């Protein structure tokens with residue numbers, strides 16, 4: 076009897092969300108569908124050009140932890156906010172979802188991270204992230220008892236951008252593995268993979284990471300190829316389990332030579348793709364820690380992702396457990 | 406040419422929005438469908454019990470001004486935030502909509518007002534508002550040139566709760582009337598009417614207010630009757646024009662002995678009624694300042710209200726001008 080099914084570790088971020096036209100992205104040199112890092116000056120500039128917005132707690136791993144709790148699993152989260160209103164919002168939303176969260180702010184500056192996310196008519200999301208307080212996350216923030224007591228510890232590739240977060244992750248990998256737990260990561264973003272390609276491959280090949288999440292674009296970026304079949308063959312050789320998502324084409328779960336293909340769920344409309352990969356990881360990891368088959372893990376991932384893309388905001392506002400029951404998955 | 410069609414004046418608030426069950430309201434002694442004033446201690450208590458939430462700029466008059474701008478009218482706003490992140494969000498959202506907003510914060514404390522709004526399955530909204538920096542709004546915040554150059558100055562009955570806002574409003578009424586403009590108010594909330602019944606009647610009877618907005622519950626509270634026909638007859642005698650909304654039953658515009666009845670729009674589903682009255686006022690006041698008939702003003706009001714109730718959050722995220730064009734209201 077362990078205390079947590081899934082610990083996640085990521086950049087703690089509040090999202091600021093608006094719709095825009097395609098030309099807005101071009102005019103402002105925003106890379107479509109990507110996570111674009113920005114400084115404080117650029118943050119104020121972009122905000123001045125953004126329309127009326129909505130705020131919602133975000134952060135890739137934060138969303139994943141919230142998803143696992145929503146499904147009925149037991150989640151914990153490490154991430155660093157500031158002692159400010161955005162940080163209070165972030166802390167409230169994750170704890171109110173039933174995620175064990177106790178990372179203490181270090182002060183009011185830098186302020187809590189925020190990401191201006193522009194959603195185009197096709198439902199694609201383009202994020203512009205000022206990391207703020209996330210740069211302070213370090214080994215001091217590792218609750219060792221929580222890592223030791225979690226079936227899986229999952230983290231963002233995005234943590235390679237701030238300076239010291241990787242040290243916390245290496246500590247987590249050591250503690251998790253010494254206690255017989257598993258480590259998992261998401262490749263996060265194809266440009267993130269481009270920045271840290273060798274480091275990410277080393278995480279997998281050295282066995283610090285057991286389960287890897289990627290979408291098509293991230294897998295292609297990892298091996299610097301446009302051949303998807305090649306990318307799947309390569310990723311399967313580099314990690315114990317890979318879960319690769321393909322948007323409207325569903326997902327494929329790889330284990331050695333084993334491949335499990337899962338369909339995307341039928342949807343009403345792609346309102347906003349923000350959170351899709353995060354919630355895929357929620358469903359997958361919930362299923363995994365409940366002892367379900369790899370195929371069923373994929374099915375739970377696709378359900379949760381399919382739900383989140385039909386709403387504005389990155390964390391489902393409806394019950395995923397109720398959805399899973401209805402879909403005959405639980 | 407004036408500079409503004411509609412100046413609005415109200416409590417500058419950021420909304421914190423969540424769905425709840427019917428029992429939540431009862432367990433927490435929250436008056437359903439009402440605006441419930443709360444202190445800082447109660448705000449922290451209620452927030453601790455609230456689920457994960459979404460934030461969106463609110464304030465009844467703020468919403469109204471944003472609605473006028475969305476329709477293509479020229480709006481201005483007076484309302485006081487703090488120099489904090491919530492205030493920054495408020496300032497951004499209203500200015501980004503093209504509302505002329507210049508009210509400077511006086512410091513960081515008290516913090517910017519927020520309202521915890523609980524939306525039940527029927528789409529009714531129950532608000533719990535900590536006024537914060539709104540208590541500092543006073544005569545010093547009246548931009549006399551803006552009032553002088555606005556065709557209509559509209560304000561909330563809610564302004565009677567903070568201590569000095571009413572003095573600002575009396576100054577506005579003087580300036581507006583000296584420049585041949587009109588004054589309008591909304592009764593805001595039936596308990597608000599109960600607190601300030603005598604004062605509201607005096608505003609109307611003394612001619613400080615020319616156009617009054619009410620819903621059924623506010624009209625009934627004003628005259629302390631459950632006879633709606635009686636309330637209509639009475640309100641028509643007390644103000645030059647009364648616009649009275651009746652939820653799904655539409656609206657009626659009264660001027661002397663004249664009555665103009667308007668149908669509600671038919672709805673797919675009522676998602677969240679937050680902002681309905683505020684956007685009815687946007688549509689009405691946009692029509693009024695464009696020289697439209699009272700019936701057409703009522704039609705523009707009902708269109709805007711019908712749109713806002715079909716989304717989460719109090720300010721339409723779609724184009725009201727586009728909707729009005731499609732409706733042949735133009």
Ligand SMILES: Nc1ncnc2c1ncn2[C@@H]1O[C@H](CO)[C@@H](O)[C@H]1O
Pocket residue numbers: 085086088089090110132133134135136138190202204231233234349350351352353389
């Ligand atoms: N640099 C980043 N690190 C972690 N998460 C991020 C980053 N930028 C944006 N996000 C989050 O990605 C989520 C969608 O996957 C959004 O909720 C947003 O908060």
Ligand SMILES: Nc1ncnc2c1ncn2[C@@H]1O[C@H](CO)[C@@H](O)[C@H]1O
Pocket residue numbers: 415416418419420440462463464465466468520532534561563564679680681682683719
């Ligand atoms: N005391 C108040 N004064 C002005 N507006 C309020 C108050 N309480 C809640 N609101 C606003 O009423 C709006 C809905 O009419 C919400 O957007 C909310 O911000």
Ligand SMILES: O=C(NCO)c1ccccc1
Pocket residue numbers: 112113114206210236237238
């Ligand atoms: O946040 C950044 N780096 C990690 O600390 C950043 C900011 C602006 C531009 C590029 C990277």
Ligand SMILES: O=C(NCO)c1ccccc1
Pocket residue numbers: 159160163164167491516519
């Ligand atoms: O005002 C807040 N915190 C103290 O500055 C606050 C505001 C909104 C949500 C949570 C906390």
Ligand SMILES: O=C(NCO)c1ccccc1
Pocket residue numbers: 265266269295296297299300301
């Ligand atoms: O190599 C990439 N894609 C596959 O051809 C790549 C490179 C830089 C940024 C994103 C993807």
Ligand SMILES: O=C(NCO)c1ccccc1
Pocket residue numbers: 272297298299
């Ligand atoms: O690791 C490779 N690419 C990513 O940098 C690689 C190495 C040898 C052959 C093909 C791909």
Ligand SMILES: O=C(NCO)c1ccccc1
Pocket residue numbers: 442443444536540566567568
């Ligand atoms: O804010 C209040 N009044 C106006 O300043 C208030 C707060 C809590 C309870 C009652 C009124």
Ligand SMILES: O=C(NCO)c1ccccc1
Pocket residue numbers: 161186189489490493494497
């Ligand atoms: O960080 C902000 N302001 C300085 O404290 C901020 C955050 C969100 C929206 C606007 C401003």
Ligand SMILES: O=C(NCO)c1ccccc1
Pocket residue numbers: 595596599625626627629630631
């Ligand atoms: O008088 C009221 N309603 C009409 O019967 C009333 C009184 C207090 C609060 C709300 C409505």
Ligand SMILES: O=C(NCO)c1ccccc1
Pocket residue numbers: 602627628629
């Ligand atoms: O003004 C009245 N009620 C609200 O206080 C009133 C006065 C006389 C007769 C009926 C209603």
Ligand SMILES: [K+]
Pocket residue numbers: 347348349350383384385386387388389390
């Ligand atoms: K979404």
Ligand SMILES: [K+]
Pocket residue numbers: 677678679680713714715716717718719720
């Ligand atoms: K609404």
